[PDB]
Amino acid sequence: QVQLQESGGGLVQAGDSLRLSCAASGRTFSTYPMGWFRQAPGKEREFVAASSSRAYYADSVKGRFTISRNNAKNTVYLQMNSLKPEDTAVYYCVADSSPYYRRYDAAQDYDYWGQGTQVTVSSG
Amino acid sequence: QVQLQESGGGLVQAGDSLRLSCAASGRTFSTYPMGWFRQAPGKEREFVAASSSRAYYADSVKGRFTISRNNAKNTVYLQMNSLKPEDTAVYYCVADSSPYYRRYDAAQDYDYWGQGTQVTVSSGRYP
Amino acid sequence: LEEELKQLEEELQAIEEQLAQLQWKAQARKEKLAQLKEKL
Amino acid sequence: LEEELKQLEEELQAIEEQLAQLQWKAQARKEKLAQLKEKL
């Protein structure tokens, strides 16, 4: 049925840039907040970025990462710069289909989750 | 403590009126939506009326009950007219202290509940 | 499309009921706030 | 009273955050609805 499919992960060197893509293919998603979460080794899923009335960013990625959307294509993107080894994680695309209030940085408030794409940043 | 104290219940004849008052004595009830639920003998708690940006009424009391508020006295009122025996119940004052959205007709979305006041309406046919 | 239309309208109605309540809650708190600031 | 003030101000900020997202959710749905009604 409805799904979110991430692509663009892989192995990268420290200092590089990378762009993740997430195609939403269930229904229209232009009315939904969309965002990214990540899970690093031995850590919980953590908020990275969200897009709704505006863009929101976790402090750990502010000024290096940008979230954007192509509404016509039903897609959301995570543009990553100045990558560090601590950015290594599985990166998950998320969406909020609720007409009720939901907190942009709470993983449990997104009801649609992609399967995730692995990003690995090796040390210099 | 904090209290919601209902007063004004009692025994009346079918067709009479009653005014329920709910004196809120916690603090700062002016920022809270307030309302009334009722529980009839052996039935569940039923929504009656609520007041926030506007008044809301259960269909069974529209045109007979009016909810109003006086912030200065920290009170909410339920004016009950054209009372029927089917209105006999314990009536509970409710308040919603949350700054998040709460559904006006859902008993579980009000976090403050009064102890309840009994309203008994005798039928027009008396033996 | 007809189902999309109906759900959009139901969602918009739910959002309008939330906005009505949240705005009243905010206005009441602003009123209290000004009073508290005057007391202080 | 100072803590009451602080908590009131936090509640007001929490309501502003809800209103911001809900108004965006409504505007996005109204735009989609307008497109759908024109199509229909």
Author numbering:
A (entry chain C): 1 to 124
B (entry chain A): 1 to 127
C (entry chain B), D (entry chain D): 1 to 40
In the authors' words:
Here, we present and characterize a panel of nanobodies that can be used to functionalize designed proteins built using CC dimers such as protein origami. The nanobodies were selected to bind to different CC modules representing the edges of the designed tetrahedral protein. The crystal structures of five complexes consisting of CC dimers and nanobodies show that the nanobodies bind primarily to the noninteracting sites of the CC dimers and, in addition to complementarity determining region 3 (CDR) loops, strongly rely on the nanobody framework residues for binding. The most extensively characterized protein origami cage, tetrahedron TET12SN, self-assembles from a single 461 amino acid residue polypeptide chain consisting of 12 CC dimer-forming modules adopting antiparallel or parallel orientations (APH2, BCR2, GCN2, P3-P4, P5-P6, and P7-P8).
The CDR2 loop interacts only with one APH chain, while CDR1 and CDR3 extend over the first chain and create numerous interactions with the second APH chain. The APH interface is centered on W24 at position f (W24f), which is partially shielded from the solvent by CDR1 and CDR2 loops. Furthermore, the residues of CDR1 form two salt bridges with the APH residues R29d and E4g’ (CC positions on the second chain are marked with an apostrophe: a’ to g’). However, most interactions are mediated by the long CDR3 loop, which forms main-chain interactions with Q21c and K25g. The tip of the CDR3 loop (sequence PYY) shields the hydrophobic residues in the core of CC dimer. Using computational alanine scanning, we identified that energetically most important interactions (hotspots) are mediated by the APH residues W24f and K25g as well as Q21c and L22d. Slightly weaker interactions are mediated by the residues R29d and I15d’ and L8d’ and Q18g’ on the second APH chain. Thermodynamic parameters for the binding of Nb26 to APH2 were obtained using isothermal titration calorimetry (ITC) and show that the binding affinity is very high (Kd = 39 nM), mainly due to the favorable enthalpic contribution (ΔH = −28 kcal ⋅ mol−1) (all thermodynamic parameters are listed in SI Appendix, Table S2). When the APH segment is placed in the context of TET12SN, the Nb26-TET12SN affinity is higher compared with APH2 alone, Kd = 1.8 nM, suggesting that APH2 may be more rigid in the context of the cage compared with the isolated peptide dimer. A notable exception is the Nb262-APH2 complex, where the paratope is formed exclusively by CDR loops.
